[PDB]
């Protein structure tokens, strides 16, 4: 719906309030997700200069090569 | 204008070809056959047959509109597009000794 | 019956021996298509830097590190 | 790729379609294909001496 | 980062210094790329006149139609 | 259980490191296998081009139709 | 293995050379197939509009629901 | 376990009969739409050439080769 | 490439010579184009007063809103 | 094995149930923005027509018919 | 065509007749426009002092940053 | 096949003629479908804002996780 | 030999026609059967939910544990 508040409980949006702080698109698994990864967190962060990078707390078996960090 | 021509020296033994392991253990023309690895056969024979194929393909005809293999067994594939370009005719000039 | 179980055995061997469609060709092409897209987007910045007159060290590149080594 | 049986059977034992390069293996270059034969669309002109 | 030096080792930029030389952007496959197409290079070249074209050293079946030689 | 080292002594994996090496998945019978086939070896070999082919050292009367040499 | 000719004699593909002809992929049974179906064929037909269709010459009881037309 | 295996056979037949929509509409339209971008980019050159008064031979065209020939 | 003569065979440029004849840009598909539209053409014509319009010979399902004239 | 195929169906179940974001936002904004340019393009003609004192019927517009009537 | 009458029914322009009235250019979406904005209008109104401002009836989320009035 | 008249009797498309009504793609089982779910329907409905959702009339045990609603 | 008509009169197949009916495979003894069980029968019934069960009209001493109901 909006960046400030979303219509899903499992999705959170971090909006930058200044030019010297980063933005994050964090999502936590749940509902129909696998029980092993039921409570893992997955976020997409953006540096203030305009660089997007991907990271997650899931196990290295489950990590894609594009987010192996 | 354009014509299709072979590309000499641009063909490599990629290795996506499996020599057939013989179940009979001898030179029987028939019998069940296997798909064996390319590394079994010697590299010298591989180079020799590749060189023979290259000679058959390129050296047989440099600039011609040959026939493409109906079963794919061509020996150097080229083509001419549209009306083939004619030789400016061989200028025979005759002088007879009286 | 003994015949029924060998029939199951024949089914198992048949199913497991399915031919692989050689997915290496599919995967390799997709990665190549990805790499040229990123360097394709790099054409915009380099072109103006040439047309502006800036030097190599003076040209700003907004490049992001790629897992495919670019 | 098509077919790479252009080469003869030098060094092979001929048994029907089988080119036995060894006592235990043979090849069928009609199917044994591992060469990427290349063809281009050239341009050419005629010069008279 | 910059044309002279970038943030990735596999990326090389050929920045022209004269009106009679070309520009080139070359990328080398690796890391998360396929092992078969490892160490191959795809380059985007620019003539000093202003025409762009693509080329690559990968196998033909891996070559896209927009980058065919 | 990783490709380089597995948790079972009867399973070995040949992992290619370059574009010209071929993968191999070899399994040697034993333990609960028949005494006649107590030390036979069963392997899957993968060409570098991406083609999977089958080979085994068991007798012909024991070879299944798919891997019937 | 090319579309013009492949490595297997039991498989052939008709490639469309124009915009008013249909594409077809034909597979003839044999080798390790059942003798009762040793010479019947299964084909995939592609209409020039982009629609795929299937037909086969095997008997009805051996014919699954996937190629009923 | 005879009846167990043909469940997969029924599944294989079910999945293999998956409907394939006409992707020709999507690819051709994208190819046709791309042609316009190549074709429409030359409108500026032609419009300027006509308003400049130069002839056909005097109208420099910065056209780059396209794999679609459009 | 010029308006009179171009470096590509599939591109045709009609340069007007008077104030009553219309300018036109003609482009023909081919090479890497789809087989269905392998020989179709798309054209942009410019009226003597200076109006640019687009038309194409492809099927209706291939015409976007831009050139569905 | 009835477990590999069942997992495949679940994977097919997962892939088909992807969340599709509202693409209507992107399309509608593009149409309005493009129309914004066309409506803003005729400003120059209106200004001088007002400043030169020409009547509404005497002010010639170089407007062309477009797919979007805006 | 002309300010009094144009070649499109969906575009109308309010031309002032004195120095105390305003100029406005109004365009209505439709035809190839999105259905959600089928009958919405965007207006460029010109103040009699010569200042131009843009307004539209389209929803807030679809409004561009320039016509957020 | 068009949305107004589909090529299959089991596929029905609800085309919205205005900006306030929703689109629906209803697919009813039959023919090769299971006898238990022979007369059930599966639909894809789209809100005017652009949000798609899935509904099905089959039993819960046959409902996937995506269309469990 | 189909479900509608069997090869022999001693075998009867009850094929359901709707989603609420149950299948039944009933076989009446005879021919080479014992005189005591000359006119007995054994039936396999299948519930619409997908449950199979066995019923037999033979005496208790001839009933196995499989169809002891």
TrEMBL record, chains C, H, J:
<comment type="subunit">
    <text>The pili are polar flexible filaments of about 5.4 nanometers diameter and 2.5 micrometers average length; they consist of only a single polypeptide chain arranged in a helical configuration of five subunits per turn in the assembled pilus.</text>
</comment>
<feature type="transmembrane region" description="Helical">
    <location>
        <begin position="1"/>
        <end position="20"/>
    </location>
</feature>
<feature type="disulfide bond">
    <location>
        <begin position="49"/>
        <end position="59"/>
    </location>
</feature>
<protein>
    <submittedName>
        <fullName>Fimbrial protein</fullName>
    </submittedName>
</protein>
<comment type="similarity">
    <text>Belongs to the N-Me-Phe pilin family.</text>
</comment>
Automatic annotation (TrEMBL), chain D:
<protein>
    <submittedName>
        <fullName>Maturation protein</fullName>
    </submittedName>
</protein>
<comment type="similarity">
    <text>Belongs to the Leviviricetes maturation protein family.</text>
</comment>
């Amino acid at each position: 719906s909006t960046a400030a508040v979303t219509g899903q409980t499992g999705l959170t949006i971090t909006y930058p309030a200044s030019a010297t702080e980063s933005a994050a698109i964090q999502g936590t698994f749940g509902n129909s997700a696998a029980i092993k990864i039921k409570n893992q967190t997955l976020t997409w962060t953006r540096t203030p200069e305009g660089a997007w990078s991907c990271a997650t707390t899931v196990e290295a078996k489950f990590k894609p090569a594009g987010c192996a960090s | 204008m354009n014509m299709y021509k072979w590309v000499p020296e641009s063909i490599r033994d990629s290795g996506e070809g499996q020599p057939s392991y013989s179940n009979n253990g001898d030179y029987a023309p028939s019998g069940p056959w296997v798909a064996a690895g390319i590394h079994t056969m010697p590299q010298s024979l591989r180079d020799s047959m590749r060189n023979s194929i290259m000679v058959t393909a390129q050296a047989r005809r440099d600039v011609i509109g040959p026939e493409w293999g109906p079963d794919g067994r061509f020996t150097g594939y080229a083509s001419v597009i549209g009306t083939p370009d004619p030789k400016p005719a061989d200028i025979v000039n005759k002088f007879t000794v009286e | 019956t003994l015949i029924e179980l060998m029939i199951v055995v024949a089914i198992i061997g048949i199913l497991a021996a399915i031919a692989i469609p050689q997915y290496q060709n599919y995967i390799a092409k997709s990665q190549v298509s990805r790499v040229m897209s990123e360097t394709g987007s790099l054409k915009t910045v380099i072109e103006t830097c040439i047309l502006d007159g800036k030097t190599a060290a003076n040209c700003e590149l907004g490049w992001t590190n790629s897992n495919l080594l670019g | 790729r098509i077919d790479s049986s252009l080469a003869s059977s030098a060094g092979f034992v001929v048994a029907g379609e089988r080119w036995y390069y060894t006592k235990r293996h043979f090849i069928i270059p009609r199917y044994f294909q591992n060469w990427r034969m290349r063809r281009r669309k050239y341009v050419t002109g005629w010069v008279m001496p």
